[PDB]
Amino acid sequence: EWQENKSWNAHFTEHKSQGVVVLWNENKQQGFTNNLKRANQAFLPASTFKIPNSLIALDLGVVKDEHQVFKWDGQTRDIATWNRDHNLITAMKYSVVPVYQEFARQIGEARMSKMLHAFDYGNEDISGNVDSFWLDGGIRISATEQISFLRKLYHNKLHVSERSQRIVKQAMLTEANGDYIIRAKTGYSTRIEPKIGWWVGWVELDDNVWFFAMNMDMPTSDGLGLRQAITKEVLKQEKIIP
Amino acid sequence: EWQENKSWNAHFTEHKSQGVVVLWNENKQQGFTNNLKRANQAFLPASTFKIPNSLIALDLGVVKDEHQVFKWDGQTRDIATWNRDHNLITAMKYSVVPVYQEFARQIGEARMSKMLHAFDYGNEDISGNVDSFWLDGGIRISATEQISFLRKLYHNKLHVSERSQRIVKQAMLTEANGDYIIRAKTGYSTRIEPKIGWWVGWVELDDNVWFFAMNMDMPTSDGLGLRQAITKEVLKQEKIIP
Ligand SMILES: *C(=O)[C@@H]([C@@H]1NC(C(=O)O)=C(S[C@@H]2CN[C@H](CNS(N)(=O)=O)C2)[C@@H]1C)[C@@H](C)O
Ligand SMILES: C[C@@H](O)[C@@H](C=O)[C@@H]1NC(C(=O)O)=C(S[C@@H]2CN[C@H](CNS(N)(=O)=O)C2)[C@@H]1C
Ligand SMILES: C[C@@H](O)[C@H]1C(=O)N2C(C(=O)O)=C(S[C@@H]3CN[C@H](CNS(N)(=O)=O)C3)[C@H](C)[C@H]12
Ligand SMILES: C[C@@H](O)[C@H]1C(=O)N2C(C(=O)O)=C(S[C@@H]3CN[C@H](CNS(N)(=O)=O)C3)[C@H](C)[C@H]12
Ligand SMILES: [Ca+2]
Ligand SMILES: [Ca+2]
Ligand SMILES: [Ca+2]
Ligand SMILES: [Cl-]
Ligand SMILES: [Cl-]
Ligand SMILES: [Cl-]
Ligand SMILES: [Cl-]
């Protein structure tokens, strides 16, 4: 079903961290985690919500394609990379929240709810402000539920156009070399306790796909680099990446 | 305009090589090369023809998607890479000429010809064997012509479905990190003199795209790695990648 390999807890232990890593072997239809309980604990998605938000925007024509330019609104915000024009690729890369809050308002409460239900996304609850519910509203998703959603996206099985799903998977591209391709999205939920960081996505190999979703306790912005580092220690331990 | 930059030749001579690198700044609509004459010299495309071949195969339904398996059909025909199953992703990556021979036979010469004329691909000539003309037939393409073709592909402007162009560009993924994305294709022309190696594609930045096409004399297979090496040194020299 889902095997618990607690030897992964060493990688959180060394870095003085608490969290969960979940892997899914698509060929073998087998899942692995260091913590079955935390694997199914549901949290705010934070910026991991940029994946379904992007899909819905594209499917509804709110975003025409990955080249459409979203003008900086002229408000100088805290993250310098947000203070400029963006397309879908760079808004995903730099996790540009204002662009996605605009997407959400144009999508609207009713279409957003209907799509999240169509997606079976987390708890399907978008209570709160239409442009912030994934930050401080009622939506919740677990690491295992992220995998479930991502597997559909990978197979083009979500109830949106194939084109939307291909564009979003292009925009998720994070790293690629001769050994693997990673498509993924980070998140950091701070507006409601507990403060946690996310990394969800998958690793594409020649012959298989390994889906992953991790989250960890993140009191300060210090440990944000550990989201990718710990996941990759796990991947390396299992010899998924060289 | 086309600017000549002879200073790039230092990267060929230090490797006891001769060749041409062509770069195109999409934003500026400006091209750069070390050798204007060789930049326009037309050669057999060899494995770089996998780009138009895959596009046509997908557009015509010869290949259903990037997951369809092409089974090994017994033959252990010397090359080990061709001793296993493939899909479009892996067949682009590795030398598996029987798979692309099968595409071309199914496409057939009438539609192959029509498509290469619609692509304005090289000298638009498919004379020779329908299952090998890109290796030993009459088709020829120059580095500048590779750029013209790739630019259309990047803009989804070729006269095939948008979906087929998106899939081939996925299959072209070679390298990606926080600084750049490279989509590209190698080639090695040996069946007709002169023996040459190819590397064609583009570099996606946050705010621009740099297309490239290089070829270089390749008297033996031991210099194949110099295709990527020399191209990347020219990109680094120009500060396109760090
Ligand atoms: C297509 O041009 C040709 C393929 N393509 C290539 C190529 O390198 O572009 C080759 S090279 C052959 C297979 N891999 C060996 C080299 N390994 S490496 N890591 O690149 O040094 C030798 C092959 C000839 C088809 C049409 O034959
Ligand atoms: C709620 C939203 O504000 C939040 C929700 O995800 C946003 N999404 C993400 C994310 O994690 O993708 C970030 S990260 C941000 C960029 N610069 C700092 C990081 N420096 S480092 N090098 O990592 O220490 C913090 C935002 C805070
Ligand atoms: C070199 C290419 O061929 C790669 C590819 O593709 N490979 C697969 C795969 O197919 O998954 C793996 S993963 C690795 C093998 N098995 C271990 C755990 N398996 S297990 N019992 O935990 O499920 C991890 C390799 C990277 C190999
Ligand atoms: C930091 C990111 O935003 C990157 C991006 O995007 N950038 C562009 C671009 O926009 O091309 C470049 S390239 C570099 C600047 N100019 C030189 C050649 N100029 S020139 N006149 O010879 O063509 C090479 C940077 C990598 C920067
Ligand atoms: Ca449901
Ligand atoms: Ca050099
Ligand atoms: Ca033949
Ligand atoms: Cl967001
Ligand atoms: Cl499903
Ligand atoms: Cl070929
Ligand atoms: Cl991609």
UniProtKB/Swiss-Prot annotation, chains A, B:
Catalytic activity, reaction form: a beta-lactam + H2O = a substituted beta-amino acid
Main enzyme class: hydrolase
Binding positions (a beta-lactam): S47, K50, S95, R227
The keyword Hydrolase appears for this protein: yes
Disulfide bonds: none
Record GO biological process: antibiotic catabolic process; cell wall organization; response to antibiotic
Activity regulation, per record: Inhibited by avibactam, related diazabicyclooctane (DBO) derivatives and by bicyclic boronic acids, via a covalent binding to Ser-47. Inhibited by chloride, bromide and iodide ions. Not inhibited by the beta-lactamase-blocking agents, clavulanic acid or tazobactam.
EC number: 3.5.2.6
Pfam families linked to this entry: Transpeptidase
Entry superkingdom: Bacteria
GO MF terms held by the record: beta-lactamase activity; penicillin binding
Induction of its expression: Expressed from an upstream promoter, P(out), in an insertion sequence IS1999.
One GO location term (cellular component): plasma membrane
Modification N6-carboxylysine occurs at: K50
Matching InterPro entries: Bact_Transpept/Beta-Lactamase, Beta-lactam/transpept-like, Beta-lactam_class-D_AS, PCN-bd_Tpept
Impact after mutating S47G: Increases thermal stability. Abolishes hydrolysis of cephalothin and decreases catalytic efficiency about 60-fold with respect to ampicillin
Role description: Class D beta-lactamase which confers resistance to the beta-lactam antibiotics, including amoxicillin, and moderate resistance to cephalosporins and carbapenems such as cephalothin and imipenem; in the DH10B strain of E.coli. Acts via hydrolysis of the beta-lactam ring. Has oxacillin-, cephalothin- and imipenem-hydrolyzing activities.
Oligomer and partners: Monomer. Dimer.
Assigned protein family: Belongs to the class-D beta-lactamase family.
Protein name: Beta-lactamase OXA-48
Organism: Klebsiella pneumoniae
Gene name per UniProt: OXA-48
